[PDB]
Amino acid sequence: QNIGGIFIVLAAGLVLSVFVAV
């Protein structure tokens, strides 16, 4: 649980992945 701080910065793309839909 040290560098999980980046398993969570990871999310920024899985959040960004939504937009091109239209």
Partner 1 sequence: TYVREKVIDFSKPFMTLGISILYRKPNGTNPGVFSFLNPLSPDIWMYV
Q: Which residues would be at the binding site for partner 1 (CB under 8 A)? A: 1-4, 7
Indicate the residue among 5 and 21 with the shorter CB distance to partner 1.
5
Indicate the residue among 6 and 21 with the shorter CB distance to partner 1.
6
C-alpha–C-alpha distance, residues 14 and 9, integer Å: 10
Indicate the residue among 3 and 15 with the shorter CB distance to partner 1.
3
Contacts of 22 (CB under 8 A, 6+ apart): none
Least Å distance between CB 3 and partner 1?
7
C-alpha–C-alpha distance, residues 21 and 11, integer Å: 18
